[PDB]
Design a protein around this ligand. Structure first.
Ligand code: UD1
Length: 286
């Protein structure tokens, strides 16, 4: 399975922070925002990843992350000329995807919870159908909304429904089989090519599966100044009090066996006259 990070968009709501800096390059505590969704692809077991951003921002992401070899993965880059919908990721990413299954994660989404990687690995390993992730939010009408009623079997999915039919937002993380590329080509503007029609396609096939994230999963709003700060405080809090790191790419690569001890030490050194190395050195001499 391949992955795609859709990491473009306008800065507007975060202005002036985003006047000369890409949204998904802003700090979330101690890491660029894009580390977080990248880490979710990695934890899923996905090692071949395309990062799509604006023509302006895409060279900056390449500069940050390069081709991915120091994490033991492959990163490629393409450009979204204009933000005409999430489903465009599959048109732009058509050649990258090939015949493969593919996950899409949004560059501003932040996921956390103790059972989360098992959930990612399971979704990555379903060769058929689509898996989405629902999250109990206070303001359903601001997102995609999924209704189920079971048994947890999906019954409808509406984008920003004037009145909602559940408390469950459809978060910015989606797993697909290869049929998604023909599906994206075949949907029509709602002016956006919308991820919610992609998901309605799987639903009419009866092959749209939802993971409901309840106690105790986090999904962090990254949209406003206040919610960016909240996200940052959450990561710091959980890292400081529970002695773990969230989305530490180097740690994740090492723990999944992608890179060796010696490769990790090399990644940590240039970072030693700082903290972030130190946690990496502690880990590399187990
Ligand atoms: C796509 C859409 O209509 N709604 C989804 C979108 O809502 P939402 O209301 O967040 O719409 P956004 O435009 O903020 O989610 C889009 C995010 O991806 C980026 N972007 C958007 C379009 C594009 O062509 N390229 C691009 O990179 C935007 O910069 C933004 O970061 O994400 C939510 C989860 O986070 C979902 O619950 C919604 O179902």
């Amino acid at each position: 399975m391949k992955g795609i990070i859709l990491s473009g968009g306008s800065g507007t709501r975060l202005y002036p922070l985003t006047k000369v800096v890409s949204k998904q390059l802003l700090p979330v505590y101690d890491k660029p925002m894009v580390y977080y969704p990248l880490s979710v692809l990695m934890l899923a077991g996905i090692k071949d990843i395309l990062i799509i951003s604006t023509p302006e921002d895409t060279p900056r992401f390449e500069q940050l992350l390069g081709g991915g070899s120091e994490l033991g993965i492959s990163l490629s880059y393409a450009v979204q000329s204009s933000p005409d919908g999430l489903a465009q990721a599959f048109i732009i990413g058509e050649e990258f995807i090939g015949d493969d299954n593919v996950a899409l994660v949004l560059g501003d989404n932040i996921f956390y919870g103790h059972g989360f990687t098992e959930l990612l690995q399971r979704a990555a390993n379903r060769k058929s159908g689509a898996t989405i992730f629902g999250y109990n939010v206070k303001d359903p009408q601001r997102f995609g909304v999924v209704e189920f009623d079971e048994k947890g079997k999906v019954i409808s999915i509406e984008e920003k429904p004037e009145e909602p039919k559940s408390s469950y937002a459809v978060t910015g993380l989606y797993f697909y089989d290869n049929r998604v590329v023909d599906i994206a080509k075949n949907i029509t503007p709602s002016g956006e090519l919308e991820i919610t029609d992609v998901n309605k396609a799987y639903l009419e096939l009866g092959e749209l599966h939802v993971e409901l994230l309840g106690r105790g999963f986090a999904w962090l709003d990254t949209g406003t100044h206040e919610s960016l700060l909240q996200a940052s405080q959450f990561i710091e809090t959980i890292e400081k009090r529970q002695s773990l790191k969230v989305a530490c790419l180097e740690e994740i690569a090492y723990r999944m066996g992608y890179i060796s001890r010696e490769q990790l030490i090399k990644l940590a050194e240039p970072l030693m006259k700082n903290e972030y190395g130190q946690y990496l050195m502690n880990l590399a001499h187990r």
